[PDB]
Design a protein around this ligand. Structure first.
Ligand SMILES: CN(C)c1cccc(-c2c(F)cc(-n3nnc4c3C(=O)c3ccccc3C4=O)cc2F)c1
Ligand SMILES: Cc1cc2nc3c(=O)[nH]c(=O)nc-3n(C[C@H](O)[C@H](O)[C@H](O)COP(=O)(O)O)c2cc1C
Ligand SMILES: CCCCCCCCCCCC[N+](C)(C)[O-]
Ligand SMILES: O=C(O)c1cc(=O)[nH]c(=O)[nH]1
Ligand code: NA
Ligand code: NA
Ligand code: NA
Length: 365
């Protein structure tokens, strides 16, 4: 456990980063993971990490965020890594290549990444068939407390964003425990402007209609994923629409197009979304605000700069029922998953919580 953690963090990951540019390293990470080339996590999930939310059991509250496995190629490997749930995507209706390379940048001095992938996607049909090949295997995983989320995007050339998302609901909804719609990615022109109220209501109404039209055992929860870059007005409006329409949850947050003061990385002024440690507390505060605006009645998946039990627990106490991480993997490697779970368990005990569920939103009380 702690042996592998130190070796990866101090030696192996710095060495890999020295050899491979970020996108190449990402591709290698997906390949290794899809092949199961990693230590089968020794950390046995305890009962106090179990969470029941979004109509499912989650064996532990630590998930892999969207964008690591964009095309659904490494799902089983990610469960093997110890994630309590897996979110794939974003997936666009038609295949598209995304932005020109280079489009991924490391900021090692900041434990951050900047990306402008631009929703590179194999497209719905490819991902549909990939998930169909393991549909019953997933049904069993979900029953065993390891659910699957699918994050739905839209094509760069789309004329009707709502129809892109509707297509995603129809094609991948039947294969997902939950679906995600971003009003929040920084690398598609006009995507975030789906945050405006009357239009946001229109979009999400259409998405929920399509979801409701699926057969009962194929009917996923629907969540909205937001950026940390929203105005106070934006957040009020989203909270209102989410409650009005009965949206099942929020993912808080995507990457930031802000550049917090103090970034040291040479590549800090690259265009794209910033992830990792400089995002952490901005994300946590966005969780805190959305939890309050929804009266704690709307499940939140908290994400941004998590690499420790403390980071995870801060988001849970702020209002998250579950958390995700991504960028930590790129600096700590696979052992970070067991690290976060072990540290989270220890902190829950230390702060007198019976389990994760008791800690959700605790700061507000
Ligand atoms: C040694 N073994 C068995 C093993 C198994 C499974 C995975 C890995 C693994 C890893 F988890 C992460 C990386 N990695 N290194 N630098 C970066 C990455 C990224 O994944 C990444 C992703 C997105 C933007 C940027 C990056 C990025 O800069 C490289 C890996 F090989 C290693
Ligand atoms: C390289 C990269 C690609 C990403 N791609 C997506 C994506 O396709 N869809 C999405 O909703 N979020 C995407 N994200 C955002 C992550 O899901 C997550 O919200 C964000 O990175 C903050 O978590 P972290 O600090 O633990 O990385 C991506 C992030 C990174 C770093
Ligand atoms: C309140 C705005 C702050 C902007 C970003 C804050 C980053 C916190 C620095 C701690 C991260 C740990 N490390 C090793 C990556 O430096
Ligand atoms: O594909 C991308 O560029 C991307 C999508 C998203 O939702 N978030 C992010 O940081 N990048
Ligand atoms: Na399934
Ligand atoms: Na379902
Ligand atoms: Na405002």
């Amino acid at each position: 456990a702690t042996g592998d953690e130190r070796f990866y963090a101090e030696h192996l990951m710095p060495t890999l980063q020295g050899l491979l540019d970020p996108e190449s390293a990402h591709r290698l990470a997906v390949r290794f993971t899809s092949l199961g080339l990693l230590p089968r996590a020794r950390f046995q999930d305890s009962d106090m990490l179990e969470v029941r939310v979004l109509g499912h059991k989650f064996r532990n509250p630590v998930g892999i965020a969207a964008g690591f496995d964009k095309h659904g190629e490494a799902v089983d490997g990610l469960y093997k890594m110890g994630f309590g749930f897996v979110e794939i995507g974003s997936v666009t209706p038609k295949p598209q290549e995304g932005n020109p390379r280079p489009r991924v940048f490391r900021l090692p001095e900041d434990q951050a990444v900047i990306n402008r992938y631009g929703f590179n996607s194999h497209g719905l049909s490819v991902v549909e068939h990939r998930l169909r090949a393991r549909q019953q295997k997933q049904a069993k995983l979900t029953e065993d407390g390891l659910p699957l989320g699918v994050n739905l995007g839209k094509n760069k050339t789309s004329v009707d964003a709502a129809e892109d998302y509707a297509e995603g609901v129809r094609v991948l909804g039947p294969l997902a425990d939950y679906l995600v719609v971003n009003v929040s990615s920084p690398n598609t022109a006009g995507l975030r402007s789906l945050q405006g109220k009357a239009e946001l209501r229109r979009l999400l109404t259409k998405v929920l209609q399509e979801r409701d039209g699926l057969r009962r055992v194929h009917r996923p929860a629907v969540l909205v994923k937001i950026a940390p870059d929203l105005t106070s007005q934006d957040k009020e409006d989203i909270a209102s629409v989410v409650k009005e329409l009965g949206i099942d949850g929020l993912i808080v947050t995507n990457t930031t197009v802000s550049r917090p003061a103090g970034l040291q990385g040479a590549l800090r002024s690259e265009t794209g979304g910033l992830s990792g440690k400089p995002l952490r507390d901005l994300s946590t505060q966005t969780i805190r605000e959305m939890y309050a605006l929804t009266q704690g009645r709307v499940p939140i998946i908290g994400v941004g700069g998590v690499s420790s039990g403390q980071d995870a627990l801060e988001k849970i106490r702020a209002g998250a029922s579950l958390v995700q991480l991504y960028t930590a993997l790129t600096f700590w490697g696979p052992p970070v998953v067991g690290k976060v779970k072990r540290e989270l368990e220890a902190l829950l005990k230390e702060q007198g919580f019976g389990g994760v569920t008791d800690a959700i939103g605790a700061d507000h009380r």
